[PDB]
mmCIF file of C-alpha atoms and ligand atoms in Angstrom:
data_model
loop_
_atom_site.group_PDB
_atom_site.id
_atom_site.type_symbol
_atom_site.label_atom_id
_atom_site.label_comp_id
_atom_site.label_asym_id
_atom_site.label_seq_id
_atom_site.Cartn_x
_atom_site.Cartn_y
_atom_site.Cartn_z
ATOM 1 C CA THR A 1 -0.060 -0.020 0.005
ATOM 2 C CA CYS A 2 1.145 3.433 -1.037
ATOM 3 C CA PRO A 3 2.156 5.672 1.925
ATOM 4 C CA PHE A 4 0.527 9.019 2.510
ATOM 5 C CA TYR A 5 3.534 11.180 1.662
ATOM 6 C CA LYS A 6 3.529 9.827 -1.949
ATOM 7 C CA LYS A 7 0.051 11.108 -2.561
ATOM 8 C CA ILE A 8 -0.962 14.554 -3.697
ATOM 9 C CA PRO A 9 -4.371 15.403 -2.065
ATOM 10 C CA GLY A 10 -7.041 16.847 -4.232
ATOM 11 C CA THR A 11 -5.678 15.237 -7.326
ATOM 12 C CA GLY A 12 -5.533 11.976 -9.045
ATOM 13 C CA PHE A 13 -1.677 12.086 -8.640
ATOM 14 C CA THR A 14 1.104 10.032 -7.038
ATOM 15 C CA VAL A 15 4.874 10.795 -6.951
ATOM 16 C CA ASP A 16 7.533 7.984 -7.183
ATOM 17 C CA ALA A 17 4.931 5.285 -6.431
ATOM 18 C CA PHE A 18 5.466 2.420 -8.737
ATOM 19 C CA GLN A 19 6.045 -0.498 -6.270
ATOM 20 C CA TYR A 20 2.527 -0.627 -4.876
ATOM 21 C CA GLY A 21 0.599 -2.173 -7.869
ATOM 22 C CA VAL A 22 -2.421 -0.180 -9.134
ATOM 23 C CA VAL A 23 -2.917 2.732 -6.598
ATOM 24 C CA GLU A 24 -6.729 3.294 -6.056
ATOM 25 C CA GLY A 25 -7.818 6.454 -7.789
ATOM 26 C CA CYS A 26 -4.325 7.428 -9.288
ATOM 27 C CA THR A 27 -4.912 8.730 -12.849
ATOM 28 C CA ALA A 28 -1.367 9.848 -13.447
ATOM 29 C CA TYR A 29 1.952 8.650 -11.959
ATOM 30 C CA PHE A 30 4.754 11.317 -11.689
ATOM 31 C CA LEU A 31 8.456 10.245 -11.616
ATOM 32 C CA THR A 32 10.942 12.740 -10.251
ATOM 33 C CA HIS A 33 14.231 11.081 -11.528
ATOM 34 C CA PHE A 34 15.701 7.765 -12.758
ATOM 35 C CA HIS A 35 17.088 6.368 -9.309
ATOM 36 C CA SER A 36 16.083 2.804 -8.460
ATOM 37 C CA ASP A 37 14.411 3.494 -4.982
ATOM 38 C CA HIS A 38 12.157 5.849 -6.984
ATOM 39 C CA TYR A 39 11.428 4.021 -10.097
ATOM 40 C CA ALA A 40 10.984 0.602 -8.344
ATOM 41 C CA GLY A 41 8.260 -1.163 -10.083
ATOM 42 C CA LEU A 42 8.306 0.327 -13.590
ATOM 43 C CA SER A 43 8.994 -2.103 -16.548
ATOM 44 C CA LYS A 44 7.815 -2.713 -20.078
ATOM 45 C CA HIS A 45 4.368 -4.004 -18.881
ATOM 46 C CA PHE A 46 3.339 -0.721 -17.236
ATOM 47 C CA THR A 47 0.139 0.669 -18.871
ATOM 48 C CA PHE A 48 -0.735 3.874 -16.937
ATOM 49 C CA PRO A 49 0.569 7.371 -18.011
ATOM 50 C CA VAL A 50 3.936 8.416 -16.546
ATOM 51 C CA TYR A 51 4.786 12.138 -16.430
ATOM 52 C CA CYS A 52 8.519 13.048 -16.223
ATOM 53 C CA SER A 53 11.342 15.096 -17.713
ATOM 54 C CA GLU A 54 12.575 14.433 -21.302
ATOM 55 C CA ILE A 55 15.893 12.822 -19.956
ATOM 56 C CA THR A 56 13.921 10.600 -17.516
ATOM 57 C CA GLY A 57 11.626 9.637 -20.400
ATOM 58 C CA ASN A 58 14.813 8.619 -22.551
ATOM 59 C CA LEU A 59 15.904 6.302 -19.716
ATOM 60 C CA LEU A 60 12.397 4.740 -19.192
ATOM 61 C CA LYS A 61 12.172 3.959 -22.916
ATOM 62 C CA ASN A 62 15.767 2.650 -23.516
ATOM 63 C CA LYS A 63 16.715 1.092 -20.245
ATOM 64 C CA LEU A 64 13.447 -0.188 -18.782
ATOM 65 C CA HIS A 65 11.552 -0.742 -22.041
ATOM 66 C CA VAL A 66 8.474 1.254 -21.130
ATOM 67 C CA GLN A 67 6.457 1.695 -24.215
ATOM 68 C CA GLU A 68 6.362 5.129 -25.747
ATOM 69 C CA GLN A 69 2.555 5.546 -25.621
ATOM 70 C CA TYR A 70 2.664 5.662 -21.826
ATOM 71 C CA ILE A 71 5.561 8.066 -21.463
ATOM 72 C CA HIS A 72 4.611 11.764 -21.144
ATOM 73 C CA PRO A 73 7.721 14.019 -21.078
ATOM 74 C CA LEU A 74 7.212 17.773 -20.070
ATOM 75 C CA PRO A 75 9.428 20.818 -20.709
ATOM 76 C CA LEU A 76 10.967 22.449 -17.668
ATOM 77 C CA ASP A 77 9.976 25.904 -16.479
ATOM 78 C CA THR A 78 6.756 25.716 -18.369
ATOM 79 C CA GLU A 79 3.106 25.804 -17.123
ATOM 80 C CA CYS A 80 1.362 22.482 -18.417
ATOM 81 C CA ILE A 81 -2.084 21.120 -17.802
ATOM 82 C CA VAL A 82 -2.435 17.436 -16.710
ATOM 83 C CA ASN A 83 -5.845 15.882 -16.121
ATOM 84 C CA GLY A 84 -7.151 19.430 -15.580
ATOM 85 C CA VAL A 85 -4.498 20.537 -13.083
ATOM 86 C CA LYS A 86 -1.665 23.034 -13.760
ATOM 87 C CA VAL A 87 1.853 21.760 -13.121
ATOM 88 C CA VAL A 88 5.363 23.031 -13.568
ATOM 89 C CA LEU A 89 8.673 20.932 -13.565
ATOM 90 C CA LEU A 90 11.798 22.645 -12.148
ATOM 91 C CA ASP A 91 15.382 21.629 -12.164
ATOM 92 C CA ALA A 92 16.214 19.705 -8.928
ATOM 93 C CA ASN A 93 20.174 20.074 -9.044
ATOM 94 C CA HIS A 94 20.258 16.298 -8.313
ATOM 95 C CA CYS A 95 21.178 13.757 -11.095
ATOM 96 C CA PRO A 96 20.487 14.385 -14.823
ATOM 97 C CA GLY A 97 16.771 14.743 -15.601
ATOM 98 C CA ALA A 98 15.858 15.161 -11.868
ATOM 99 C CA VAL A 99 12.947 17.455 -11.277
ATOM 100 C CA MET A 100 10.907 19.214 -8.502
ATOM 101 C CA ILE A 101 7.092 19.498 -9.210
ATOM 102 C CA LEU A 102 4.757 22.424 -8.487
ATOM 103 C CA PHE A 103 1.116 21.536 -8.273
ATOM 104 C CA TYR A 104 -1.596 24.254 -8.509
ATOM 105 C CA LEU A 105 -4.671 22.646 -6.880
ATOM 106 C CA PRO A 106 -8.246 23.469 -8.108
ATOM 107 C CA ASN A 107 -9.174 24.889 -4.605
ATOM 108 C CA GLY A 108 -6.113 27.257 -4.611
ATOM 109 C CA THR A 109 -3.577 25.363 -2.548
ATOM 110 C CA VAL A 110 -0.041 25.340 -3.946
ATOM 111 C CA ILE A 111 2.187 22.315 -3.346
ATOM 112 C CA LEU A 112 5.885 21.804 -4.074
ATOM 113 C CA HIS A 113 7.401 18.224 -4.148
ATOM 114 C CA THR A 114 11.226 18.550 -4.246
ATOM 115 C CA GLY A 115 11.844 14.920 -5.215
ATOM 116 C CA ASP A 116 15.526 14.323 -4.464
ATOM 117 C CA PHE A 117 17.425 17.807 -4.616
ATOM 118 C CA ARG A 118 20.440 19.894 -3.687
ATOM 119 C CA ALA A 119 19.006 23.251 -2.706
ATOM 120 C CA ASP A 120 20.764 26.248 -4.203
ATOM 121 C CA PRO A 121 20.199 30.017 -3.965
ATOM 122 C CA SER A 122 19.559 29.904 -7.790
ATOM 123 C CA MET A 123 16.161 28.290 -7.096
ATOM 124 C CA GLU A 124 15.191 31.569 -5.376
ATOM 125 C CA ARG A 125 14.839 33.092 -8.941
ATOM 126 C CA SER A 126 13.006 30.255 -10.678
ATOM 127 C CA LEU A 127 9.179 30.345 -11.065
ATOM 128 C CA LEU A 128 9.021 29.661 -7.269
ATOM 129 C CA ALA A 129 9.658 33.329 -6.578
ATOM 130 C CA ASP A 130 6.232 34.484 -7.934
ATOM 131 C CA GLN A 131 3.743 32.894 -5.458
ATOM 132 C CA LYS A 132 2.981 31.397 -2.193
ATOM 133 C CA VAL A 133 3.479 27.606 -1.472
ATOM 134 C CA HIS A 134 1.301 26.160 1.139
ATOM 135 C CA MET A 135 2.769 22.613 1.501
ATOM 136 C CA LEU A 136 6.321 21.378 0.973
ATOM 137 C CA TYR A 137 7.156 17.603 0.414
ATOM 138 C CA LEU A 138 10.902 17.867 1.323
ATOM 139 C CA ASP A 139 13.999 15.780 0.626
ATOM 140 C CA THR A 140 15.311 15.558 4.255
ATOM 141 C CA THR A 141 18.198 13.048 3.605
ATOM 142 C CA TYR A 142 20.739 15.202 5.499
ATOM 143 C CA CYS A 143 18.423 17.161 7.898
ATOM 144 C CA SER A 144 20.852 17.419 10.824
ATOM 145 C CA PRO A 145 23.558 19.919 11.539
ATOM 146 C CA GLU A 146 26.413 17.445 11.584
ATOM 147 C CA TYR A 147 25.874 17.044 7.870
ATOM 148 C CA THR A 148 28.373 19.415 6.378
ATOM 149 C CA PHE A 149 30.273 18.903 2.985
ATOM 150 C CA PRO A 150 32.044 21.192 0.521
ATOM 151 C CA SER A 151 30.716 22.660 -2.680
ATOM 152 C CA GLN A 152 30.699 20.544 -5.707
ATOM 153 C CA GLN A 153 33.120 22.924 -7.419
ATOM 154 C CA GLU A 154 35.840 22.583 -4.568
ATOM 155 C CA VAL A 155 35.489 18.756 -4.633
ATOM 156 C CA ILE A 156 36.025 18.787 -8.515
ATOM 157 C CA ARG A 157 38.968 21.057 -8.043
ATOM 158 C CA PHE A 158 40.464 18.628 -5.586
ATOM 159 C CA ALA A 159 39.989 15.625 -7.895
ATOM 160 C CA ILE A 160 41.239 17.359 -11.062
ATOM 161 C CA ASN A 161 44.533 18.548 -9.367
ATOM 162 C CA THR A 162 45.010 15.126 -7.723
ATOM 163 C CA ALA A 163 44.682 13.150 -10.937
ATOM 164 C CA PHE A 164 46.697 15.610 -13.007
ATOM 165 C CA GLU A 165 49.562 15.518 -10.516
ATOM 166 C CA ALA A 166 49.663 11.712 -10.256
ATOM 167 C CA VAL A 167 49.600 11.077 -13.987
ATOM 168 C CA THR A 168 52.213 13.783 -14.809
ATOM 169 C CA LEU A 169 54.544 12.180 -12.294
ATOM 170 C CA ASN A 170 53.761 8.657 -13.686
ATOM 171 C CA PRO A 171 52.508 8.416 -17.389
ATOM 172 C CA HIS A 172 51.825 4.757 -16.754
ATOM 173 C CA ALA A 173 49.295 5.357 -13.996
ATOM 174 C CA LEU A 174 45.512 4.538 -14.768
ATOM 175 C CA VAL A 175 42.709 6.398 -13.197
ATOM 176 C CA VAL A 176 39.464 4.505 -12.226
ATOM 177 C CA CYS A 177 36.240 6.110 -11.040
ATOM 178 C CA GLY A 178 33.442 4.157 -9.297
ATOM 179 C CA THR A 179 29.646 4.413 -10.453
ATOM 180 C CA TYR A 180 26.373 2.576 -9.606
ATOM 181 C CA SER A 181 23.594 4.813 -10.910
ATOM 182 C CA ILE A 182 23.198 8.094 -12.818
ATOM 183 C CA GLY A 183 24.533 11.334 -11.201
ATOM 184 C CA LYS A 184 27.977 12.710 -10.425
ATOM 185 C CA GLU A 185 29.143 12.423 -14.021
ATOM 186 C CA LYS A 186 31.149 15.713 -13.486
ATOM 187 C CA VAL A 187 33.756 13.695 -11.464
ATOM 188 C CA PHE A 188 34.937 11.555 -14.237
ATOM 189 C CA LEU A 189 34.259 14.031 -17.098
ATOM 190 C CA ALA A 190 36.377 16.685 -15.430
ATOM 191 C CA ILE A 191 39.244 14.343 -14.728
ATOM 192 C CA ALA A 192 39.281 12.959 -18.380
ATOM 193 C CA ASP A 193 39.209 16.472 -19.725
ATOM 194 C CA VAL A 194 42.317 17.523 -17.670
ATOM 195 C CA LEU A 195 44.198 14.474 -18.876
ATOM 196 C CA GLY A 196 43.073 14.826 -22.505
ATOM 197 C CA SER A 197 41.457 11.339 -22.701
ATOM 198 C CA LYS A 198 38.048 9.905 -23.283
ATOM 199 C CA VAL A 199 36.231 7.984 -20.567
ATOM 200 C CA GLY A 200 36.172 4.319 -21.165
ATOM 201 C CA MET A 201 33.258 2.098 -19.853
ATOM 202 C CA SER A 202 30.914 -0.923 -20.450
ATOM 203 C CA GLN A 203 28.393 -1.049 -23.251
ATOM 204 C CA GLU A 204 25.566 -0.837 -20.586
ATOM 205 C CA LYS A 205 27.051 2.283 -19.042
ATOM 206 C CA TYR A 206 27.729 3.924 -22.360
ATOM 207 C CA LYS A 207 24.070 3.274 -23.347
ATOM 208 C CA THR A 208 22.818 4.923 -20.145
ATOM 209 C CA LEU A 209 25.064 8.004 -20.696
ATOM 210 C CA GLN A 210 23.758 8.332 -24.343
ATOM 211 C CA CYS A 211 20.228 9.025 -22.878
ATOM 212 C CA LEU A 212 21.265 12.030 -20.904
ATOM 213 C CA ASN A 213 21.389 15.075 -23.469
ATOM 214 C CA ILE A 214 24.982 15.899 -22.294
ATOM 215 C CA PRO A 215 26.514 18.393 -24.969
ATOM 216 C CA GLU A 216 29.333 16.946 -27.052
ATOM 217 C CA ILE A 217 29.106 13.488 -25.228
ATOM 218 C CA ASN A 218 30.362 11.519 -28.301
ATOM 219 C CA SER A 219 33.554 13.569 -27.771
ATOM 220 C CA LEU A 220 33.889 12.560 -24.068
ATOM 221 C CA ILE A 221 33.139 8.797 -23.697
ATOM 222 C CA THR A 222 33.882 5.524 -25.375
ATOM 223 C CA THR A 223 33.540 1.695 -25.205
ATOM 224 C CA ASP A 224 37.176 1.285 -26.371
ATOM 225 C CA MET A 225 38.911 0.674 -23.041
ATOM 226 C CA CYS A 226 42.360 0.429 -24.709
ATOM 227 C CA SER A 227 42.304 3.931 -26.006
ATOM 228 C CA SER A 228 41.321 5.539 -22.676
ATOM 229 C CA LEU A 229 43.239 6.378 -19.462
ATOM 230 C CA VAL A 230 40.206 7.089 -17.308
ATOM 231 C CA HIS A 231 38.034 3.924 -16.680
ATOM 232 C CA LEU A 232 34.632 3.540 -15.151
ATOM 233 C CA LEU A 233 33.790 0.551 -13.061
ATOM 234 C CA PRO A 234 31.027 -0.558 -10.766
ATOM 235 C CA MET A 235 31.339 0.920 -7.295
ATOM 236 C CA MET A 236 31.530 -2.543 -5.756
ATOM 237 C CA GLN A 237 34.725 -3.211 -7.636
ATOM 238 C CA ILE A 238 36.395 -0.065 -5.993
ATOM 239 C CA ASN A 239 38.573 -1.968 -3.445
ATOM 240 C CA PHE A 240 42.087 -3.397 -3.423
ATOM 241 C CA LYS A 241 41.061 -6.913 -4.767
ATOM 242 C CA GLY A 242 38.869 -5.462 -7.561
ATOM 243 C CA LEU A 243 41.359 -2.952 -8.743
ATOM 244 C CA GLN A 244 44.333 -5.478 -8.735
ATOM 245 C CA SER A 245 42.113 -7.714 -10.792
ATOM 246 C CA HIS A 246 41.370 -4.833 -13.219
ATOM 247 C CA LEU A 247 45.135 -3.857 -13.466
ATOM 248 C CA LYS A 248 45.853 -7.523 -14.595
ATOM 249 C CA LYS A 249 43.485 -7.048 -17.650
ATOM 250 C CA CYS A 250 45.180 -4.015 -18.960
ATOM 251 C CA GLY A 251 48.012 -6.049 -20.395
ATOM 252 C CA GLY A 252 51.073 -4.208 -18.885
ATOM 253 C CA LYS A 253 49.891 -0.788 -20.167
ATOM 254 C CA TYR A 254 49.870 0.517 -16.684
ATOM 255 C CA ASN A 255 51.735 -0.073 -13.392
ATOM 256 C CA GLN A 256 49.783 2.128 -10.924
ATOM 257 C CA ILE A 257 45.985 2.763 -10.145
ATOM 258 C CA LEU A 258 44.664 5.927 -8.679
ATOM 259 C CA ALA A 259 40.788 5.447 -7.975
ATOM 260 C CA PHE A 260 38.003 7.683 -6.784
ATOM 261 C CA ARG A 261 34.851 6.708 -4.807
ATOM 262 C CA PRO A 262 32.369 9.492 -4.876
ATOM 263 C CA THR A 263 30.293 9.044 -1.702
ATOM 264 C CA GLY A 264 27.701 11.339 -0.164
ATOM 265 C CA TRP A 265 28.623 12.307 3.501
ATOM 266 C CA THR A 266 31.061 10.263 5.520
ATOM 267 C CA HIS A 267 32.042 11.134 9.333
ATOM 268 C CA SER A 268 35.612 12.137 8.206
ATOM 269 C CA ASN A 269 33.593 15.354 7.168
ATOM 270 C CA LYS A 270 33.194 16.223 10.914
ATOM 271 C CA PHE A 271 37.038 16.567 11.239
ATOM 272 C CA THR A 272 38.621 16.877 7.838
ATOM 273 C CA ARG A 273 38.775 19.724 5.168
ATOM 274 C CA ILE A 274 38.684 18.632 1.464
ATOM 275 C CA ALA A 275 42.249 20.036 1.025
ATOM 276 C CA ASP A 276 43.415 17.660 3.798
ATOM 277 C CA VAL A 277 41.872 14.308 2.319
ATOM 278 C CA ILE A 278 44.194 11.463 2.021
ATOM 279 C CA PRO A 279 43.819 8.106 0.251
ATOM 280 C CA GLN A 280 44.065 4.573 1.535
ATOM 281 C CA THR A 281 46.963 2.857 -0.161
ATOM 282 C CA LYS A 282 48.253 -0.741 -0.746
ATOM 283 C CA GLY A 283 51.240 -1.217 -2.964
ATOM 284 C CA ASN A 284 50.687 0.569 -6.234
ATOM 285 C CA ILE A 285 47.004 1.209 -5.676
ATOM 286 C CA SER A 286 45.506 4.355 -4.057
ATOM 287 C CA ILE A 287 41.719 4.974 -3.233
ATOM 288 C CA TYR A 288 40.220 8.406 -2.471
ATOM 289 C CA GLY A 289 36.709 8.822 -0.877
ATOM 290 C CA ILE A 290 35.496 12.162 -2.007
ATOM 291 C CA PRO A 291 32.342 13.870 -0.660
ATOM 292 C CA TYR A 292 30.513 14.786 -3.877
ATOM 293 C CA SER A 293 26.861 15.283 -2.716
ATOM 294 C CA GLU A 294 23.715 15.535 -4.848
ATOM 295 C CA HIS A 295 21.580 16.232 -1.728
ATOM 296 C CA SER A 296 21.151 19.517 0.238
ATOM 297 C CA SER A 297 23.671 19.998 3.232
ATOM 298 C CA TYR A 298 21.841 20.998 6.490
ATOM 299 C CA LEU A 299 22.608 24.694 5.948
ATOM 300 C CA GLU A 300 21.520 24.744 2.285
ATOM 301 C CA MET A 301 18.275 23.069 3.299
ATOM 302 C CA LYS A 302 17.607 25.378 6.094
ATOM 303 C CA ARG A 303 18.210 28.382 3.763
ATOM 304 C CA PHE A 304 15.757 27.264 1.012
ATOM 305 C CA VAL A 305 12.977 26.429 3.569
ATOM 306 C CA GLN A 306 13.387 29.724 5.483
ATOM 307 C CA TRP A 307 13.240 31.558 2.028
ATOM 308 C CA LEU A 308 10.163 29.515 0.874
ATOM 309 C CA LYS A 309 8.290 29.972 4.145
ATOM 310 C CA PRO A 310 5.791 26.980 3.710
ATOM 311 C CA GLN A 311 2.777 26.570 5.914
ATOM 312 C CA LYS A 312 3.264 22.787 6.445
ATOM 313 C CA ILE A 313 6.365 20.535 5.820
ATOM 314 C CA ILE A 314 6.037 16.807 4.958
ATOM 315 C CA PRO A 315 9.398 14.910 4.973
ATOM 316 C CA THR A 316 9.941 12.132 2.409
ATOM 317 C CA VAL A 317 13.288 10.738 3.696
ATOM 318 C CA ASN A 318 14.193 9.290 7.166
ATOM 319 C CA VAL A 319 10.490 8.791 7.872
ATOM 320 C CA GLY A 320 10.758 5.259 9.356
ATOM 321 C CA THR A 321 11.909 5.973 12.899
ATOM 322 C CA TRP A 322 10.252 8.027 15.682
ATOM 323 C CA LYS A 323 13.705 9.373 16.774
ATOM 324 C CA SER A 324 14.261 10.700 13.127
ATOM 325 C CA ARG A 325 10.791 12.176 12.773
ATOM 326 C CA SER A 326 10.990 13.917 16.188
ATOM 327 C CA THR A 327 14.534 15.350 15.318
ATOM 328 C CA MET A 328 13.257 16.864 11.921
ATOM 329 C CA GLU A 329 10.152 18.367 13.515
ATOM 330 C CA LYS A 330 12.458 20.068 16.056
ATOM 331 C CA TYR A 331 14.525 21.665 13.265
ATOM 332 C CA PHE A 332 11.506 22.803 11.370
ATOM 333 C CA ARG A 333 10.094 24.609 14.442
ATOM 334 C CA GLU A 334 13.468 26.221 15.113
ATOM 335 C CA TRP A 335 13.709 27.487 11.546
ATOM 336 C CA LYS A 336 10.131 28.787 11.609
ATOM 337 C CA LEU A 337 10.779 30.703 14.949
ATOM 338 C CA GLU A 338 14.104 32.154 13.875
ATOM 339 C CA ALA A 339 12.731 33.458 10.605
ATOM 340 C CA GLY A 340 9.184 34.596 11.821
ATOM 341 C CA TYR A 341 6.845 32.925 9.441
HETATM 342 NI NI1 NI B 401 18.017 10.111 -5.967
#
């Protein structure tokens, strides 16, 4: 049974609710972004209308084989009418194709569902700025003050300089980057660009990246591993055993691996600055964990909510424990009292 916080009252609508079978009274199923916890349940046999971004619709069609007739892509930043209700899709600053959804209810209520997002001050000048929002369905993944991490730009700077230094010192070093889903493509694209290489990867990964509308992509990626000095691998293979095994397969082209694991937050963030990060090393293999987040930090979240001034907040993440729920409700009340709404 679909939980309440995936339902949009006063509509026939659900958000990211594909694992519950046929939801009673749902006339249109919205998908915020192509991540498995959200899409769970979609497949080629789905016969209800799905509303999403153009990128998300590319992935539904090519990766999950949903039939075209049921995929309804919408342009961003544009007022659209779906089953007699006005909606707008906004960029979520999450993974490619990820959106927030504004719903304009027939009774005058205005609802924002953030899906998964990284709040940014640039959002304060989207179509949100022009009207009041009564209810906010909020991505609360890192809704606690201990969650700090750097900007995405500083993290990319760290990785570029790290990889460029290592490979200039040793031209026979291979760089490997871990991946398990879409998002965080900047990590491996930025590194390959500084090294003047393409990024090499499996045919299944190449296919997924071809759905994303990234400019000049045929110039940046490839399935020819032999021609590339930045390789992508499954995240599970980013360990000493997996990387040694991969270095065997490269046929004496390389004698050193430098690898990156983009994580979200890790407790080394409560002590260490990005500048100060060090790898784990064993022989000729080094592994850096880098805190490249596609979710709001605590401070970024607080600023967005205090700017938006919603009347009611409904969390969509960390909802399974009473301790988590109680913690989030405390911060929401603090924020409301400090800002005065
Ligand atoms: Ni996500």
